[PDB]
Short mmCIF file of N, CA, C and O in Angstrom, two decimals:
data_model
loop_
_atom_site.label_atom_id
_atom_site.label_comp_id
_atom_site.label_asym_id
_atom_site.label_seq_id
_atom_site.Cartn_x
_atom_site.Cartn_y
_atom_site.Cartn_z
N UNK A 15 -1.48 3.67 -12.54
CA UNK A 15 -2.46 4.75 -12.24
C UNK A 15 -1.82 5.87 -11.43
O UNK A 15 -0.63 5.82 -11.12
N UNK A 16 -2.61 6.89 -11.08
CA UNK A 16 -2.11 8.01 -10.30
C UNK A 16 -2.37 7.81 -8.81
O UNK A 16 -3.51 7.93 -8.35
N UNK A 17 -1.31 7.51 -8.05
CA UNK A 17 -1.44 7.29 -6.62
C UNK A 17 -0.27 7.93 -5.86
O UNK A 17 0.82 8.09 -6.41
N UNK A 18 -0.50 8.30 -4.60
CA UNK A 18 0.53 8.92 -3.79
C UNK A 18 0.85 8.07 -2.56
O UNK A 18 0.15 8.15 -1.55
N UNK A 19 1.90 7.26 -2.66
CA UNK A 19 2.30 6.40 -1.55
C UNK A 19 3.46 7.02 -0.76
O UNK A 19 4.24 7.80 -1.31
N UNK A 20 3.55 6.68 0.52
CA UNK A 20 4.61 7.22 1.37
C UNK A 20 5.58 6.11 1.80
O UNK A 20 5.15 5.06 2.27
N UNK A 21 6.88 6.37 1.64
CA UNK A 21 7.89 5.39 2.02
C UNK A 21 8.50 5.75 3.38
O UNK A 21 8.18 6.79 3.95
N UNK A 22 9.38 4.89 3.89
CA UNK A 22 10.02 5.15 5.18
C UNK A 22 10.94 6.37 5.07
O UNK A 22 11.26 7.01 6.07
N UNK A 23 11.37 6.68 3.84
CA UNK A 23 12.24 7.82 3.60
C UNK A 23 11.47 8.98 2.96
O UNK A 23 12.05 9.78 2.22
N UNK A 24 10.17 9.08 3.25
CA UNK A 24 9.36 10.15 2.69
C UNK A 24 9.56 10.33 1.19
O UNK A 24 9.48 11.45 0.68
N UNK A 25 9.83 9.23 0.48
CA UNK A 25 10.04 9.29 -0.96
C UNK A 25 8.70 9.25 -1.71
O UNK A 25 7.76 8.60 -1.27
N UNK A 26 8.64 9.95 -2.84
CA UNK A 26 7.42 9.98 -3.65
C UNK A 26 7.56 9.07 -4.87
O UNK A 26 8.32 9.37 -5.79
N UNK A 27 6.82 7.96 -4.88
CA UNK A 27 6.87 7.02 -5.99
C UNK A 27 5.47 6.77 -6.56
O UNK A 27 4.47 7.12 -5.95
N UNK A 28 5.42 6.15 -7.74
CA UNK A 28 4.15 5.85 -8.39
C UNK A 28 3.82 4.36 -8.26
O UNK A 28 4.71 3.53 -8.14
N UNK A 29 2.53 4.04 -8.27
CA UNK A 29 2.09 2.65 -8.15
C UNK A 29 0.95 2.35 -9.12
O UNK A 29 0.05 3.18 -9.32
N UNK A 30 0.98 1.17 -9.73
CA UNK A 30 -0.06 0.76 -10.67
C UNK A 30 -1.06 -0.18 -10.00
O UNK A 30 -0.68 -1.06 -9.23
N UNK A 31 -2.35 0.01 -10.30
CA UNK A 31 -3.39 -0.82 -9.72
C UNK A 31 -4.45 -1.19 -10.76
O UNK A 31 -4.86 -0.35 -11.56
N UNK A 32 -4.89 -2.45 -10.74
CA UNK A 32 -5.90 -2.92 -11.67
C UNK A 32 -7.28 -2.95 -11.00
O UNK A 32 -7.38 -2.82 -9.78
N UNK A 33 -8.35 -3.12 -11.79
CA UNK A 33 -9.72 -3.17 -11.25
C UNK A 33 -9.87 -4.22 -10.16
O UNK A 33 -10.23 -3.90 -9.03
N UNK A 34 -9.60 -5.48 -10.50
CA UNK A 34 -9.71 -6.58 -9.53
C UNK A 34 -8.39 -6.82 -8.79
O UNK A 34 -8.03 -7.96 -8.53
N UNK A 35 -7.67 -5.75 -8.45
CA UNK A 35 -6.40 -5.88 -7.74
C UNK A 35 -6.63 -6.22 -6.27
O UNK A 35 -7.17 -5.41 -5.51
N UNK A 36 -6.21 -7.42 -5.86
CA UNK A 36 -6.37 -7.85 -4.48
C UNK A 36 -5.21 -7.35 -3.62
O UNK A 36 -4.14 -7.04 -4.14
N UNK A 37 -5.42 -7.27 -2.31
CA UNK A 37 -4.37 -6.81 -1.40
C UNK A 37 -3.11 -7.67 -1.51
O UNK A 37 -2.00 -7.18 -1.36
N UNK A 38 -3.29 -8.97 -1.79
CA UNK A 38 -2.16 -9.88 -1.93
C UNK A 38 -1.48 -9.71 -3.29
O UNK A 38 -0.25 -9.73 -3.38
N UNK A 39 -2.29 -9.54 -4.34
CA UNK A 39 -1.75 -9.37 -5.69
C UNK A 39 -0.91 -8.09 -5.79
O UNK A 39 0.08 -8.05 -6.51
N UNK A 40 -1.31 -7.05 -5.06
CA UNK A 40 -0.59 -5.78 -5.08
C UNK A 40 0.78 -5.90 -4.39
O UNK A 40 1.64 -5.03 -4.57
N UNK A 41 1.00 -6.97 -3.62
CA UNK A 41 2.27 -7.16 -2.93
C UNK A 41 3.44 -7.14 -3.92
O UNK A 41 4.53 -6.68 -3.58
N UNK A 42 3.21 -7.62 -5.14
CA UNK A 42 4.26 -7.63 -6.16
C UNK A 42 4.61 -6.21 -6.60
O UNK A 42 5.78 -5.91 -6.87
N UNK A 43 3.61 -5.33 -6.66
CA UNK A 43 3.83 -3.95 -7.07
C UNK A 43 4.73 -3.21 -6.07
O UNK A 43 5.63 -2.48 -6.47
N UNK A 44 4.47 -3.41 -4.78
CA UNK A 44 5.27 -2.76 -3.74
C UNK A 44 6.72 -3.25 -3.77
O UNK A 44 7.63 -2.50 -3.43
N UNK A 45 6.93 -4.50 -4.19
CA UNK A 45 8.28 -5.06 -4.26
C UNK A 45 9.13 -4.33 -5.31
O UNK A 45 10.35 -4.38 -5.27
N UNK A 46 8.46 -3.65 -6.26
CA UNK A 46 9.16 -2.91 -7.31
C UNK A 46 10.22 -1.96 -6.75
O UNK A 46 11.18 -1.61 -7.45
N UNK A 47 10.06 -1.52 -5.50
CA UNK A 47 11.02 -0.60 -4.89
C UNK A 47 12.31 -1.33 -4.53
O UNK A 47 13.33 -1.15 -5.20
N UNK A 48 12.28 -2.15 -3.48
CA UNK A 48 13.48 -2.88 -3.06
C UNK A 48 13.15 -3.98 -2.05
O UNK A 48 13.89 -4.18 -1.09
N UNK A 49 12.06 -4.71 -2.28
CA UNK A 49 11.68 -5.78 -1.37
C UNK A 49 11.61 -5.31 0.07
O UNK A 49 12.59 -5.41 0.81
N UNK A 50 10.44 -4.81 0.48
CA UNK A 50 10.25 -4.33 1.84
C UNK A 50 10.03 -5.50 2.81
O UNK A 50 9.00 -6.17 2.76
N UNK A 51 11.00 -5.76 3.70
CA UNK A 51 10.91 -6.86 4.67
C UNK A 51 9.71 -6.73 5.61
O UNK A 51 8.98 -7.71 5.83
N UNK A 52 9.48 -5.54 6.19
CA UNK A 52 8.36 -5.31 7.11
C UNK A 52 7.07 -5.98 6.66
O UNK A 52 6.32 -5.42 5.84
N UNK A 53 6.80 -7.17 7.19
CA UNK A 53 5.59 -7.91 6.84
C UNK A 53 4.33 -7.21 7.37
O UNK A 53 3.23 -7.46 6.88
N UNK A 54 4.49 -6.34 8.37
CA UNK A 54 3.35 -5.63 8.94
C UNK A 54 3.24 -4.21 8.39
O UNK A 54 2.83 -3.29 9.10
N UNK A 55 3.61 -4.02 7.12
CA UNK A 55 3.53 -2.70 6.49
C UNK A 55 2.19 -2.53 5.77
O UNK A 55 1.90 -3.24 4.81
N UNK A 56 1.38 -1.59 6.25
CA UNK A 56 0.08 -1.34 5.64
C UNK A 56 -0.27 0.15 5.67
O UNK A 56 0.50 0.97 6.17
N UNK A 57 -1.43 0.50 5.12
CA UNK A 57 -1.87 1.89 5.09
C UNK A 57 -2.84 2.18 6.23
O UNK A 57 -3.54 1.29 6.71
N UNK A 58 -2.88 3.44 6.66
CA UNK A 58 -3.77 3.84 7.75
C UNK A 58 -4.98 4.61 7.22
O UNK A 58 -5.04 5.84 7.32
N UNK A 59 -5.94 3.89 6.65
CA UNK A 59 -7.14 4.51 6.10
C UNK A 59 -8.34 3.56 6.17
O UNK A 59 -8.33 2.50 5.55
N UNK A 60 -9.36 3.95 6.94
CA UNK A 60 -10.55 3.14 7.09
C UNK A 60 -10.22 1.75 7.65
O UNK A 60 -10.89 0.77 7.32
N UNK A 61 -9.19 1.67 8.49
CA UNK A 61 -8.80 0.40 9.08
C UNK A 61 -8.73 -0.73 8.06
O UNK A 61 -9.54 -1.65 8.09
N UNK A 62 -7.76 -0.65 7.15
CA UNK A 62 -7.60 -1.68 6.12
C UNK A 62 -6.34 -2.51 6.37
O UNK A 62 -5.25 -1.96 6.53
N UNK A 63 -6.49 -3.83 6.40
CA UNK A 63 -5.36 -4.72 6.63
C UNK A 63 -4.69 -5.10 5.31
O UNK A 63 -5.35 -5.58 4.39
N UNK A 64 -3.38 -4.89 5.23
CA UNK A 64 -2.62 -5.21 4.02
C UNK A 64 -2.32 -6.71 3.93
O UNK A 64 -2.11 -7.24 2.84
N UNK A 65 -2.30 -7.39 5.08
CA UNK A 65 -2.01 -8.82 5.10
C UNK A 65 -3.24 -9.64 4.70
O UNK A 65 -3.11 -10.68 4.05
N UNK A 66 -4.43 -9.19 5.11
CA UNK A 66 -5.67 -9.87 4.80
C UNK A 66 -5.76 -10.22 3.32
O UNK A 66 -4.81 -10.05 2.56
N UNK A 67 -6.93 -10.69 2.92
CA UNK A 67 -7.16 -11.05 1.53
C UNK A 67 -8.26 -10.22 0.90
O UNK A 67 -9.08 -10.75 0.15
N UNK A 68 -8.29 -8.93 1.21
CA UNK A 68 -9.31 -8.04 0.66
C UNK A 68 -8.78 -7.28 -0.55
O UNK A 68 -7.58 -7.08 -0.69
N UNK A 69 -9.69 -6.85 -1.42
CA UNK A 69 -9.31 -6.11 -2.62
C UNK A 69 -9.50 -4.61 -2.42
O UNK A 69 -10.29 -4.18 -1.58
N UNK A 70 -8.77 -3.81 -3.19
CA UNK A 70 -8.86 -2.35 -3.09
C UNK A 70 -10.27 -1.86 -3.43
O UNK A 70 -10.77 -0.91 -2.84
N UNK A 71 -10.91 -2.51 -4.41
CA UNK A 71 -12.25 -2.13 -4.84
C UNK A 71 -13.27 -2.19 -3.69
O UNK A 71 -14.11 -1.31 -3.56
N UNK A 72 -13.19 -3.24 -2.87
CA UNK A 72 -14.12 -3.40 -1.76
C UNK A 72 -14.09 -2.20 -0.81
O UNK A 72 -15.08 -1.93 -0.12
N UNK A 73 -12.97 -1.47 -0.77
CA UNK A 73 -12.85 -0.31 0.11
C UNK A 73 -13.13 1.00 -0.65
O UNK A 73 -12.85 2.08 -0.13
N UNK A 74 -13.68 0.90 -1.86
CA UNK A 74 -13.98 2.09 -2.66
C UNK A 74 -12.76 2.98 -2.84
O UNK A 74 -12.89 4.20 -3.00
N UNK A 75 -11.56 2.39 -2.83
CA UNK A 75 -10.33 3.16 -3.01
C UNK A 75 -9.97 3.26 -4.49
O UNK A 75 -9.35 2.35 -5.05
N UNK A 76 -10.35 4.36 -5.12
CA UNK A 76 -10.06 4.57 -6.54
C UNK A 76 -8.78 5.39 -6.72
O UNK A 76 -8.21 5.89 -5.75
N UNK A 77 -8.33 5.51 -7.97
CA UNK A 77 -7.12 6.27 -8.28
C UNK A 77 -7.15 7.65 -7.63
O UNK A 77 -8.22 8.19 -7.35
N UNK A 78 -5.97 8.22 -7.39
CA UNK A 78 -5.86 9.54 -6.77
C UNK A 78 -6.42 9.53 -5.34
O UNK A 78 -6.79 10.58 -4.81
N UNK A 79 -6.49 8.35 -4.72
CA UNK A 79 -7.00 8.25 -3.35
C UNK A 79 -5.97 8.75 -2.34
O UNK A 79 -4.86 9.12 -2.71
N UNK A 80 -6.35 8.75 -1.07
CA UNK A 80 -5.45 9.19 -0.01
C UNK A 80 -4.94 8.01 0.80
O UNK A 80 -5.46 7.71 1.88
N UNK A 81 -3.93 7.32 0.28
CA UNK A 81 -3.36 6.16 0.96
C UNK A 81 -2.09 6.53 1.72
O UNK A 81 -1.06 6.83 1.12
N UNK A 82 -2.17 6.52 3.05
CA UNK A 82 -1.03 6.86 3.89
C UNK A 82 -0.45 5.60 4.55
O UNK A 82 -1.17 4.87 5.22
N UNK A 83 0.84 5.37 4.35
CA UNK A 83 1.50 4.20 4.94
C UNK A 83 2.14 4.55 6.27
O UNK A 83 2.15 5.71 6.68
N UNK A 84 2.68 3.54 6.96
CA UNK A 84 3.32 3.75 8.25
C UNK A 84 4.84 3.71 8.12
O UNK A 84 5.38 2.90 7.36
N UNK A 85 5.52 4.58 8.86
CA UNK A 85 6.98 4.63 8.82
C UNK A 85 7.59 3.49 9.63
O UNK A 85 7.21 3.26 10.77
N UNK A 86 8.54 2.78 9.03
CA UNK A 86 9.20 1.66 9.70
C UNK A 86 10.48 2.12 10.40
O UNK A 86 11.56 1.58 10.15
N UNK A 87 10.37 3.11 11.28
CA UNK A 87 11.52 3.63 12.00
C UNK A 87 11.87 2.73 13.19
O UNK A 87 13.03 2.40 13.41
N UNK A 88 10.84 2.33 13.94
CA UNK A 88 11.04 1.46 15.10
C UNK A 88 10.95 -0.01 14.71
O UNK A 88 9.92 -0.46 14.21
N UNK A 89 12.04 -0.75 14.92
CA UNK A 89 12.04 -2.16 14.58
C UNK A 89 11.30 -3.01 15.59
O UNK A 89 10.55 -3.92 15.22
N UNK A 90 11.50 -2.73 16.88
CA UNK A 90 10.84 -3.49 17.92
C UNK A 90 11.77 -4.44 18.63
O UNK A 90 11.43 -4.88 19.75
#
């Protein structure tokens, strides 16, 4: 589908999402880049947890939505 995700390198990539796509099921799609180690990598919109077991549909997040991710600059 048509989505705008943000990477740690401000790269613009595309992502596919299905109707019943769960937050856990989508983990495979994000791996398409290069296996992101950051287990705490999620988006900052309507307080949505990427680790939880919620689906994108429950958050009314349809294609062409505004999904902003967090930059993994600081390791900790």
